[PDB]
Amino acid sequence: ESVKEFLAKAKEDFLKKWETPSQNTAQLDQFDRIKTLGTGSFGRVMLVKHKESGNHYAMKILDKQKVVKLKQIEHTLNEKRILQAVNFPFLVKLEFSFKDNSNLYMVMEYVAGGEMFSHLRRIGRFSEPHARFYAAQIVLTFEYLHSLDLIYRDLKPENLLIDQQGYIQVTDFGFAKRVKGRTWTLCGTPEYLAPEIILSKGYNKAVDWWALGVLIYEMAAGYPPFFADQPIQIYEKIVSGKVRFPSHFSSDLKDLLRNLLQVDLTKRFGNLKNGVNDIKNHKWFATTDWIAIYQRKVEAPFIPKPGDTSNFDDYEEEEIRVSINEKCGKEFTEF
Amino acid sequence: EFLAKAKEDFLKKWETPSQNTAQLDQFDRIKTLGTGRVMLVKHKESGNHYAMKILDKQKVVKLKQIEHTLNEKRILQAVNFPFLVKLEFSFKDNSNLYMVMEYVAGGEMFSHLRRIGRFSEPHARFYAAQIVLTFEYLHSLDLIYRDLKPENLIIDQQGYIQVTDFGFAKRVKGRTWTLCGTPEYLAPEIIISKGYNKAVDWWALGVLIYEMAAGYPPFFADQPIQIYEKIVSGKVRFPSHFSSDLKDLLRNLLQVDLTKRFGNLKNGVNDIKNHKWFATTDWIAIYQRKVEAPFIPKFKGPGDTSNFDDYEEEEIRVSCGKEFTEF
Amino acid sequence: VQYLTRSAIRRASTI
Ligand SMILES: [Mg+2]
Ligand SMILES: [Mg+2]
């Protein structure tokens, strides 16, 4: 199976860069600071132009001191260390990284289309061939990531960026862990959490299969399967398990979701011995060409409108000052 | 005039405190109330019940909390206000600090809120007014409380709020930088490290009011960092059942912009006290506690802890002393 | 049923 063969060349390469992460692949003065695309609690994201190439990138400036104050040290190293070892069409690309006395830097491909969350909200919902298009992309990405013993743990619409070509690109690996065994952290959003997680059972990759089940549902309906304005009720409703499908759900879609949204870890699609094949063959994915999608030779249902931050917000623009003094030097040397 | 005198007696006490007015062998430690550890105690002689906060000298140190704890003690013992728990005694049994306070048998607001889910706006308004006044009091002494939240507000027998946990209160004419509090209640300034002031409590009030009315707090997640991101976003969605006047108030309280945050402007509290949500509030009436509580916890008699959860009881024995000289 | 979500359990002060 070319499928099995390609994931090994992939494991291999992931593994090289994983043992030997790439550091300082650029520096601040190679870029022009155009615009602040977003802000956070220990960093922001800036639209930049690489001076020599003339290409635009989304650049992440993490204030090293803030990162330590908020205890995000390894979460930070971990995301960087992962993005930098990873390579697949539908994951945002880390082009360059590097650091100052003051900051940490992560230059990503700029994806202007914004995130599926807004779009889905904007337009209400997605046709099933529409939803299936995005769904196909996730299945592959998980197949890839899981191959590397990586749990994503953060599937949700606002984490799926939509490129000019209309394809999904996954962002934010803060909570992704390389885990052979089982793990216990509560971290992903309430609507996408699997029963196991909520019961502090100690979960594994099958969680992402649960979450995919939720994404598909929301993409097809315009709301998640376990919704409630009260946080605690979101949790109860998941553990309960009762899922109702809008009239307009193909019998195929219903069947998929029953197998994805499945408490019985022994019967959940993804965790069985037949693997992702159970999903990739399911009757709801008959009209989908898996290698064409991987190669992006499949026409996308939607496309979003040299910059500019059109589909973004406006923010108070701050100087990127750098101390003459090296800050928190010891704890980030692995970056 | 009042504040003037309150600012006086608070000063007198703040510079002539009381220490070691009791001893461990004067109470029969009945049960654990909360979790450090707090125990329901009953005094031998008096026979009255109190709540005894027992602080482990060595974890305090190992956790670098000496100023903070020397502090709550110092402040608790010097404040006087209808909705502030009274410190009745204090002393160190040579291995851990002991603060003895009035017992407030009604329980955390927390457990009642979770049990019920959410209070009505009139119920919520009743509590809010009390904190609004308690903060005015406290700010007037130039104090910042910095630990507002349901699990820190006890309901007394009449259904009036009693504030415990002064763990993080500091006297701050000016500005401070310490990052403490509890994630869901932190204002952007304190997360964001460009220093902050007492306006941080009014933001917290907005969080409490919202959580009371709604049942959950405005910025919610299962990890603090995620909560911080939501707070910095500063973006808030309100339940549809929220009244418009309620919606208004929270927008003014949960203002990132210190320049338009209610309570931190020209009229101080009066902007809050005079807002349309509070129209039906007799503030002098609440201060005197001549308002009938919409809710009263079930108290049976001396020593009932039914309003509190159960907890394992470890023993408290004797064997880091030099550091608490003035405790 | 005891859910460990910060929407159910007592939230501890930022240590
Ligand atoms: Mg407490
Ligand atoms: Mg405390």
XYZ file of N, CA and C in Angstrom, chain A residues 24-112:
267
model
N 17.325 29.087 14.886
C 17.679 30.312 14.158
C 17.805 30.200 12.636
N 16.671 30.067 11.958
C 16.659 29.960 10.508
C 16.450 31.335 9.870
N 16.406 32.371 10.701
C 16.287 33.744 10.214
C 16.552 34.743 11.337
N 16.145 35.991 11.131
C 16.362 37.043 12.117
C 15.424 38.211 11.841
N 15.241 39.080 12.833
C 14.226 40.131 12.753
C 14.346 41.050 11.528
N 15.571 41.463 11.204
C 15.792 42.498 10.196
C 15.538 42.029 8.762
N 15.242 40.744 8.592
C 14.898 40.229 7.270
C 13.441 40.513 6.896
N 12.703 41.168 7.788
C 11.275 41.351 7.560
C 10.795 42.768 7.790
N 9.729 43.121 7.085
C 9.049 44.385 7.292
C 7.773 44.153 8.099
N 7.569 44.981 9.114
C 6.408 44.837 9.966
C 5.246 45.625 9.388
N 4.307 44.917 8.768
C 3.165 45.561 8.145
C 2.073 45.839 9.169
N 1.528 44.771 9.746
C 0.306 44.899 10.518
C 0.162 43.850 11.636
N -0.458 44.252 12.739
C -0.759 43.325 13.818
C -2.043 42.562 13.477
N -1.930 41.249 13.292
C -3.072 40.446 12.868
C -3.870 39.945 14.072
N -3.207 39.890 15.226
C -3.823 39.457 16.465
C -2.933 39.630 17.683
N -3.550 39.590 18.857
C -2.828 39.730 20.115
C -3.251 38.659 21.101
N -2.396 38.408 22.085
C -2.668 37.449 23.132
C -2.077 37.916 24.444
N -1.769 36.969 25.321
C -1.375 37.273 26.690
C 0.127 37.141 26.915
N 0.823 36.512 25.972
C 2.277 36.516 26.004
C 2.887 36.695 24.599
N 2.096 37.215 23.671
C 2.565 37.373 22.318
C 1.520 37.951 21.387
N 1.950 38.282 20.167
C 1.031 38.680 19.112
C 1.406 38.059 17.777
N 0.574 38.293 16.776
C 0.874 37.811 15.447
C 0.933 38.988 14.499
N 1.993 39.040 13.709
C 2.206 40.194 12.863
C 2.296 39.800 11.395
N 1.644 40.589 10.551
C 1.796 40.468 9.117
C 3.160 41.047 8.819
N 3.981 40.307 8.091
C 5.291 40.807 7.721
C 5.575 40.515 6.253
N 6.520 41.255 5.678
C 7.086 40.905 4.376
C 8.538 40.503 4.527
N 8.901 39.345 3.989
C 10.311 39.022 3.864
C 10.885 39.953 2.800
N 11.912 40.706 3.169
C 12.448 41.761 2.318
C 12.975 41.273 0.970
N 13.809 40.239 0.990
C 14.435 39.745 -0.233
C 13.471 38.987 -1.144
N 12.600 38.163 -0.562
C 11.673 37.362 -1.360
C 10.426 38.153 -1.739
N 10.105 39.158 -0.930
C 8.915 39.965 -1.135
C 7.642 39.253 -0.706
N 7.801 38.091 -0.081
C 6.660 37.286 0.338
C 6.163 37.643 1.734
N 4.855 37.546 1.923
C 4.236 37.847 3.211
C 4.150 36.632 4.127
N 4.376 36.862 5.412
C 4.270 35.799 6.413
C 3.577 36.287 7.677
N 2.882 35.380 8.350
C 2.330 35.687 9.657
C 3.409 35.347 10.662
N 3.829 36.338 11.436
C 4.924 36.156 12.381
C 4.448 36.248 13.836
N 4.804 35.239 14.628
C 4.429 35.151 16.037
C 5.523 35.689 16.944
N 5.266 36.807 17.615
C 6.231 37.328 18.581
C 5.838 36.953 20.006
N 6.552 35.995 20.589
C 6.358 35.634 21.995
C 7.351 36.343 22.911
N 6.846 37.244 23.743
C 7.636 37.834 24.822
C 8.112 36.745 25.788
N 9.410 36.452 25.754
C 9.986 35.364 26.542
C 9.653 35.443 28.026
N 9.624 36.653 28.571
C 9.338 36.835 29.991
C 7.885 36.506 30.321
N 6.964 37.022 29.517
C 5.557 36.698 29.681
C 5.340 35.188 29.647
N 6.024 34.515 28.726
C 5.879 33.070 28.575
C 6.207 32.333 29.873
N 7.255 32.787 30.557
C 7.691 32.190 31.818
C 6.752 32.560 32.971
N 6.298 33.807 32.965
C 5.379 34.289 33.975
C 4.102 33.461 33.950
N 3.620 33.153 32.750
C 2.389 32.378 32.596
C 2.635 30.863 32.561
N 3.877 30.455 32.814
C 4.224 29.038 32.944
C 4.159 28.235 31.634
N 4.173 28.938 30.500
C 3.983 28.315 29.192
C 5.264 27.783 28.538
N 6.344 27.690 29.305
C 7.643 27.315 28.751
C 7.642 26.075 27.846
N 7.270 24.911 28.374
C 7.290 23.680 27.575
C 6.166 23.607 26.550
N 5.004 24.141 26.906
C 3.906 24.233 25.959
C 4.423 24.951 24.715
N 5.256 25.961 24.944
C 5.837 26.745 23.859
C 6.901 25.955 23.099
N 7.916 25.483 23.814
C 8.941 24.636 23.224
C 8.334 23.463 22.474
N 7.279 22.905 23.047
C 6.626 21.728 22.501
C 5.974 22.022 21.151
N 5.278 23.148 21.051
C 4.586 23.484 19.816
C 5.608 23.750 18.730
N 6.624 24.529 19.083
C 7.689 24.886 18.161
C 8.387 23.630 17.681
N 8.830 22.826 18.644
C 9.511 21.564 18.379
C 8.676 20.623 17.515
N 7.364 20.775 17.555
C 6.522 19.898 16.766
C 6.342 20.469 15.363
N 5.931 21.727 15.288
C 5.736 22.372 13.998
C 6.967 22.244 13.109
N 8.134 22.254 13.738
C 9.417 22.289 13.051
C 9.876 20.914 12.546
N 9.195 19.864 12.988
C 9.537 18.497 12.601
C 8.522 17.950 11.603
N 7.449 18.702 11.421
C 6.241 18.212 10.786
C 6.103 18.716 9.356
N 5.482 17.914 8.506
C 5.333 18.287 7.115
C 4.194 17.542 6.441
N 3.110 18.256 6.160
C 1.951 17.673 5.501
C 1.158 18.809 4.895
N 0.549 18.568 3.730
C -0.152 19.615 2.984
C -1.122 20.446 3.821
N -1.828 19.832 4.771
C -2.927 20.524 5.437
C -2.597 20.964 6.864
N -1.309 21.157 7.127
C -0.863 21.756 8.373
C -0.139 23.036 8.028
N -0.416 24.101 8.771
C 0.278 25.369 8.570
C 1.791 25.168 8.625
N 2.514 25.873 7.764
C 3.947 25.655 7.665
C 4.712 26.684 8.481
N 5.615 26.183 9.319
C 6.611 26.990 10.006
C 7.783 27.162 9.038
N 7.919 28.353 8.460
C 9.004 28.619 7.526
C 10.304 28.911 8.268
N 10.221 29.765 9.284
C 11.396 30.184 10.038
C 11.094 30.342 11.532
N 12.122 30.173 12.361
C 12.050 30.470 13.789
C 13.384 31.081 14.236
N 13.409 31.697 15.423
C 14.601 32.382 15.959
C 14.217 33.251 17.161
N 15.203 33.832 17.846
C 14.946 34.529 19.109
C 15.900 35.693 19.401
N 15.433 36.642 20.214
C 16.224 37.791 20.667
C 16.615 37.646 22.123
N 17.098 38.753 22.681
C 17.225 38.907 24.117
C 15.840 38.847 24.726
N 14.852 39.292 23.956
C 13.509 39.474 24.489
C 12.458 38.484 23.992
N 12.465 38.180 22.698
C 11.351 37.431 22.133
C 11.687 36.104 21.487
N 10.620 35.393 21.140
C 10.679 34.160 20.386
C 9.912 34.460 19.135
N 10.276 33.786 18.054
C 9.748 34.135 16.746
C 9.345 32.922 15.956
N 8.128 32.959 15.450
C 7.660 31.876 14.622
C 6.985 32.426 13.380
N 7.674 32.303 12.249
C 7.174 32.810 10.978
C 6.406 31.714 10.256
N 5.118 31.941 10.041
C 4.266 30.947 9.401
C 3.873 31.407 8.011
N 3.425 30.469 7.185
C 2.752 30.859 5.965
C 1.567 31.695 6.393
N 1.349 32.792 5.686
C 0.193 33.638 5.899
C -1.000 33.013 5.188
N -2.091 32.810 5.917
C -3.310 32.271 5.324
C -4.430 33.281 5.522
N -4.813 33.943 4.438
C -5.628 35.150 4.542
C -7.106 34.856 4.732
